[PDB]
Design a protein around this nucleic acid. Structure first.
Ligand SMILES: [Mg+2]
Ligand SMILES: [Mg+2]
Ligand SMILES: [Mg+2]
Ligand SMILES: [Mg+2]
Ligand SMILES: [Mg+2]
Ligand SMILES: [Mg+2]
Ligand SMILES: [Mg+2]
Ligand SMILES: [Mg+2]
Ligand SMILES: [Mg+2]
Ligand SMILES: [Mg+2]
Ligand SMILES: [Mg+2]
Ligand SMILES: [Mg+2]
Ligand SMILES: [Mg+2]
Ligand SMILES: [Mg+2]
Ligand SMILES: [Mg+2]
Ligand SMILES: [Mg+2]
Ligand SMILES: [Mg+2]
Ligand SMILES: [Mg+2]
Ligand SMILES: [Mg+2]
Ligand SMILES: [Mg+2]
Ligand SMILES: [Mg+2]
Ligand SMILES: [Mg+2]
Ligand SMILES: [Mg+2]
Ligand SMILES: [Mg+2]
Ligand SMILES: [Mg+2]
Ligand SMILES: [Mg+2]
Ligand SMILES: [Mg+2]
Ligand SMILES: [Mg+2]
Ligand SMILES: [Mg+2]
Ligand SMILES: [Mg+2]
Ligand SMILES: [Mg+2]
Ligand SMILES: [Mg+2]
Ligand SMILES: [Mg+2]
Ligand SMILES: [Mg+2]
Ligand SMILES: [Mg+2]
Ligand SMILES: [Mg+2]
Ligand SMILES: [Mg+2]
Ligand SMILES: [Mg+2]
Ligand SMILES: [Mg+2]
Ligand SMILES: [Mg+2]
Ligand SMILES: [Mg+2]
Ligand SMILES: [Mg+2]
Ligand SMILES: [Zn+2]
Ligand SMILES: [Zn+2]
Ligand SMILES: [Zn+2]
Lengths: 153, 96, 25, 81, 214, 98, 127, 91
RNA sequence: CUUGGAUUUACUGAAGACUAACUACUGCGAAAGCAUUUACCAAGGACGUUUUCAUUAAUCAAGAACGAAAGUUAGGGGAUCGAAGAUGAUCAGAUACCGUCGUAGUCUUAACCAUAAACUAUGCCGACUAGGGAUCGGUUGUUGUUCUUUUAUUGACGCAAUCGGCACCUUACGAGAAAUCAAAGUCUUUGGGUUCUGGGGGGAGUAUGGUCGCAAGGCUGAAACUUAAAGGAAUUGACGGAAG
């Protein structure tokens, strides 16, 4: 609730103790229940896998990209949005990407991202048609609706 | 091309359609070939080819799904797998 | 006058009739 | 030419005509007896064959179909029937 | 007010040993100061010199070579191969009417991992006894010729280093092999490698370059 | 009435031909209709071909030619005398002038 | 033998550029245009102005040490005309007659392997 | 019989909100209430939960999709691009 | 726009378009249309055929599919050109022609629109009437030619036939008012089959009704009134800021 993007619950094994760890990822479109998700430097280029930015060739579409190494995802997290990898600078270990706003950013090549587009896109294509629809939309987001015009006060 | 050869076997020979019939036909050794649709679950697939390995039966992997495999056999339903009991006028067995 | 511009003149004048007639819809 | 024997055209000029434009249309194709070099077995083959004909004894292709007349393989001699 | 030419230092440009006349010419640059060395701002320069000049013979008058400087040793500039191109007038003199033009290109890497794009061009040849006005090849033959060009450039580049290939380009080895290989497809004339582009270079090896300079 | 049997172009058995821009006025003209002249001129005028050969550092260096293909529309070409008005019977002649 | 520069001559129909660089072309030795020799716009591309422009370039070349040049003549190119302007022929003859030695000559006019749209409109420039 | 000439599913909105908004709603609301073909079992049993969530009744496989369709065109483009870029990297 | 370094020059990068030269009285498609390579997908004409079915057909109100450009709706893109708009010129005036900017548009994805001098201003099917040289595709017989590779079973070229095309040249049996036409001929010696349209010029593709369209508009479509001409082809002349 409050999110246009669906979330995926993915279960991993703990490498050091006998326990299951459930992670909450932002679901990329095409990810299914029972799918194997591979995360790491040596992960393969498959939809839903989590890879460092340097391991992805130019033109790779990626989502939930880390702004800084290990922050677990900052960029391109809303439904239908994604990040395009523009190019690499291996000498400085840096990668150039294009953000959903159209801005180009330089990130460490060790930063991670999830291959694909965030699911739920095209949500904005439909009119809300009613004040009640917006009421229910913001009922699980925050108290920012409705807005009185300052010129009317 | 392989579709034309398979259609002749359905018209003239003997066959069973479906997972339960195929496993029975692998147990009795009456299967000459096992055809598995592309979208069949791997667990059922990896089990069907373990039965064929034990039964010494060649397996052909159809390139389409169980919707396309059914219509190739002239059926109005979905066929996830089938076994050829008697290749008749066709030479599908000679083409694997 | 040019035949092409005469057609445009009538089309613009047809447009006016429709807007004028719409008053009494 | 105002006067001309339409019923008895010159057979030389009659043969240059298209196959449908003769007095009586007649195919220019024929059937052949083909000897492959490997063995000796009469096999009747159409001159304009569309099939890769194989002799019964050994499964070796005798001819390959083309746009017009079929092309006999090397070592194969034909005699018109 | 200052005459900026009083502060310029001249350097000599040396071509690799693959060519004959290795004394290409002279260039200049702002003299080396404390803040900026002349050497670092001088590497990366590209010189375009006619191949007929690098070999003396006028038979190479229609090809012009780009030489890239990537090491400076005092007043000498150690250049490397940077690209190949035809002169504009030669190409315009080859493209006549009543004949077919066929082109092909392929991206291929050498033994030492030099990524190149190589452009091949050829024209249909009129037979000595030909009577008809035009000399056109059917599109199926052109696809086979284009296919034949690509597999020859791919084969003759990936199996050798860039220096041997440079020695291959000068006598039109690839162009002569394409003409020979397409004899059974269609008669061809003016088979040329009309342009070569360096796209990617391997990690710099000064020792390998120094071997190309004596 | 119909002035020319070719309609002033070279389109037969075709629906549409993509246009080209006139060299002189940049008017869009169909490729078959444009008056096209192929010129291969010496790059150096004949007055200067001697002193430039003497100034050449190369003994026996052949001066390159200048290759160009010019496309003109009907108004530009007629104005520039590239083509001229011919008599009613002389219009049919389409061999190159001798 | 000789010391070569590169005389990059850009001859449009409104002006004439006589530009001599080094072999790389990254270093400019002398750039005199036909517009620096006349005060009328209509003859910035005149043959007379191009000859004067070339002489100033040749004089500048001599005091720096350039004794020979290669010629790379170009027209406007791009979507516009590919034929060189009237001053390009004069600047070449003036350079040869000024004691400078001439090397290779090439046309390097920008020619498209296709073309973006050209100005003037569908109907051309109506005069 | 045919009940509505053109409004279709948007007849629930009556005369309100404007025709342009209603015909834009009709296009996307047919897509979100449709049944789609399952890529796993082959049946046409896939329906939407919330946006981006598409479940199959038969094999009980849920896949993340678009807001109003199981797959958007951008994802289909990305799927082939990733497939293509994967081939070159793995030779 | 420029000493705040313009223009120019070399090297490098990014964006969108677009496919130059090859390119033609050449090819393909129902038409609109189609020009970088390769891969994949499904089509198509012609030719060859001693294969197969046997009248299944020809043209078609109604009704469908497609339909340049421009234009509309919503995203994306927005390099270049560029309606509108703004500007510098010119002029007596110039909202224009010329010059500089420039928004929609131009590109693309989902839908709309359904019009062009959408032209060959020339319906389709069938038969016949005349010669010639070229050309594209296919097939069949044959070289003082070049080439695989040294030759064939390589491919190119050359010479003949043929079917089909895109056309062209000559003639006028014949047609036409003529310009011209191998169809615009086989029409007072008037009938092979069939679809559509016109009836002096305007008013007028206007008004109205219907119908399609978000709109712009599309399709269908009068009447009053007015008039002796309007128009086609060609001839002579006159004139032309057309050529010789
Ligand atoms: Mg955060
Ligand atoms: Mg509130
Ligand atoms: Mg408010
Ligand atoms: Mg507000
Ligand atoms: Mg108040
Ligand atoms: Mg099933
Ligand atoms: Mg009013
Ligand atoms: Mg071959
Ligand atoms: Mg006239
Ligand atoms: Mg046609
Ligand atoms: Mg048209
Ligand atoms: Mg047209
Ligand atoms: Mg013309
Ligand atoms: Mg000027
Ligand atoms: Mg100027
Ligand atoms: Mg001045
Ligand atoms: Mg002044
Ligand atoms: Mg170029
Ligand atoms: Mg502009
Ligand atoms: Mg004029
Ligand atoms: Mg009811
Ligand atoms: Mg590009
Ligand atoms: Mg062609
Ligand atoms: Mg091209
Ligand atoms: Mg109709
Ligand atoms: Mg359009
Ligand atoms: Mg359109
Ligand atoms: Mg448009
Ligand atoms: Mg838009
Ligand atoms: Mg204006
Ligand atoms: Mg004014
Ligand atoms: Mg019409
Ligand atoms: Mg026309
Ligand atoms: Mg032929
Ligand atoms: Mg014979
Ligand atoms: Mg061969
Ligand atoms: Mg061959
Ligand atoms: Mg009447
Ligand atoms: Mg009337
Ligand atoms: Mg009226
Ligand atoms: Mg309406
Ligand atoms: Mg008249
Ligand atoms: Zn045999
Ligand atoms: Zn023009
Ligand atoms: Zn399912």
């Amino acid at each position: 609730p409050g999110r246009g993007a669906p979330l995926a619950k993915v279960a991993f094994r703990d490498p050091y103790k006998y326990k299951l760890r459930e992670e909450t990822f932002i679901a990329n479109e095409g990810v299914y229940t029972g799918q194997f998700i591979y995360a790491g430097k040596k992960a393969s280029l498959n939809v839903g896998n989590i890879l460092p930015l340097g391991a992805c060739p130019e033109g790779t579409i990626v989502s939930n990209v880390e702004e800084k190494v290990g922050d677990r995802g900052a960029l391109g997290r809303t439904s239908g949005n994604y990040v395009i990898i523009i190019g690499h600078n291996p000498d400085e270990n840096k990668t150039r990407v294009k953000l959903p706003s159209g801005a180009k950013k330089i990130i460490s090549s060790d930063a991670r991202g999830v291959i694909g587009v965030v699911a739920g896109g095209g949500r904005i294509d439909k009119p809300l048609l009613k004040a009640g629809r917006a009421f229910h939309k913001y009922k699980v987001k925050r108290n920012s609706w409705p807005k009185t015009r300052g010129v009317a006060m | 091309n392989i579709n034309s050869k398979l259609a002749l076997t359905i018209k003239s020979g003997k066959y069973t359609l479906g997972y339960k019939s195929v496993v029975k036909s692998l147990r009795t050794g009456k299967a000459k070939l096992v055809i598995i649709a592309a979208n069949t679950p791997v667990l059922r697939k990896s089990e069907l080819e373990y039965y064929a390995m034990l039964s010494k039966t060649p397996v052909y992997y159809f390139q389409g799904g169980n919707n396309e495999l059914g219509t190739v056999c002239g059926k109005l339903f979905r066929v996830g797998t089938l076994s050829i009991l008697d290749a008749g006028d066709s030479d599908i067995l000679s083409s694997i | 006058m040019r035949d092409k511009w005469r057609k445009k003149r009538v089309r613009r004048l047809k447009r006016k009739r429709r807007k004028v007639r719409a008053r009494s819809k | 030419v105002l006067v001309q024997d339409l019923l008895h055209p010159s057979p030389a000029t009659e043969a240059k005509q298209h196959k449908l434009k003769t007095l009586v249309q007649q195919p220019r194709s024929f059937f052949m007896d083909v000897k492959c070099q490997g063995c000796l077995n009469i096999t009747t083959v159409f001159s304009h064959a569309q099939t890769a004909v194989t002799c019964d004894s050994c499964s070796t292709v005798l001819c390959t179909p083309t746009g017009g007349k079929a092309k006999l393989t090397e070592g194969c001699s034909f005699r018109r029937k | 007010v200052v005459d900026p030419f009083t502060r310029k230092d001249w350097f000599d440009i040396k071509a690799p040993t693959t060519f004959e006349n290795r004394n290409v010419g002279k260039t200049l640059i702002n003299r080396s100061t404390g803040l900026k060395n002349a050497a670092d701002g001088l590497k990366g320069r590209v010189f375009e010199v006619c191949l007929a000049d690098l070999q003396g013979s006028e038979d190479h008058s229609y090809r012009k070579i780009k030489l890239r400087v990537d090491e400076v040793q005092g007043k000498n500039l150690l250049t490397n191969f940077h690209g190949l191109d035809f002169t504009s007038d030669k190409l315009r003199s080859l493209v006549r009417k009543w004949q077919s033009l066929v082109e092909a290109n392929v991206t291929v890497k050498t033994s030492d991992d030099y990524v190149l794009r190589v452009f091949a061009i050829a024209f249909t040849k009129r037979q000595p006894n030909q009577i008809k006005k035009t000399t056109y090849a059917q599109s199926s033959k052109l696809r086979e010729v284009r296919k034949k060009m690509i597999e020859i450039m791919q084969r003759e580049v990936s199996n050798c280093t860039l220096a041997q290939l440079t020695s291959k380009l000068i006598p039109e080895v690839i162009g002569r092999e394409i003409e020979k290989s397409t004899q059974t497809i269609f008669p061809l004339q003016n088979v040329h490698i009309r342009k070569v582009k360096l796209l990617k270079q391997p990690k710099f090896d000064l020792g390998s370059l120094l071997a190309l300079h004596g | 009435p119909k002035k020319r049997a070719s309609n002033g172009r070279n389109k037969k058995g075709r629906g549409h031909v993509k246009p080209v821009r006139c060299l002189n006025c940049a008017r869009c003209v169909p490729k078959d209709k444009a008056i096209k002249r192929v010129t291969i001129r010496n790059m150096v005028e004949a007055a200067a071909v001697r002193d430039l050969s003497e100034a050449s550092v190369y003994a026996e260096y052949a001066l390159p030619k200048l290759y160009n293909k010019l496309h003109y529309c009907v108004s530009c070409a007629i104005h520039a005398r590239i083509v001229r008005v011919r008599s009613r019977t002389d219009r049919k002649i389409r061999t190159p002038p001798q | 033998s000789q010391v070569f520069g590169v005389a990059r001559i850009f001859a449009s129909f409104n002006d004439t550029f006589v530009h001599v660089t080094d072999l790389s072309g990254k270093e400019t030795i002398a750039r005199v245009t036909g517009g620096m020799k006349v005060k009328a716009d209509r003859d910035e591309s005149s043959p007379y102005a191009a000859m004067l422009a070339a002489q100033d370039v040749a004089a500048k070349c001599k005091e720096v040490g350039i004794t020979a040049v290669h010629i790379k003549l170009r027209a406007t190119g791009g979507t516009k005309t590919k034929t060189p302007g009237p001053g390009g022929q004069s600047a070449l003859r003036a350079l040869a007659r000024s004691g400078l030695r001439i090397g290779r000559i090439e046309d390097v006019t920008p020619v498209p392997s296709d073309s973006t749209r050209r100005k003037g409109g569908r109907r051309g420039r109506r005069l | 019989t045919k009940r509505t000439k053109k409004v279709g599913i948007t007849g629930k909105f009556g005369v309100r909100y404007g025709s342009s908004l209603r015909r834009q709603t009709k296009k996307l609301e047919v897509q979100q209430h449709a049944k789609y073909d399952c890529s796993f079992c082959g049946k046409r049993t896939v329906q939407r939960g919330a946006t981006g969530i598409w479940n199959c009744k038969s094999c009980k496989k849920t896949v993340a999709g678009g807001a109003y369709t199981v797959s958007t065109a951008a994802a289909a483009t990305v799927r082939s691009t990733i497939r293509r870029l994967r081939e070159l990297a793995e030779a």
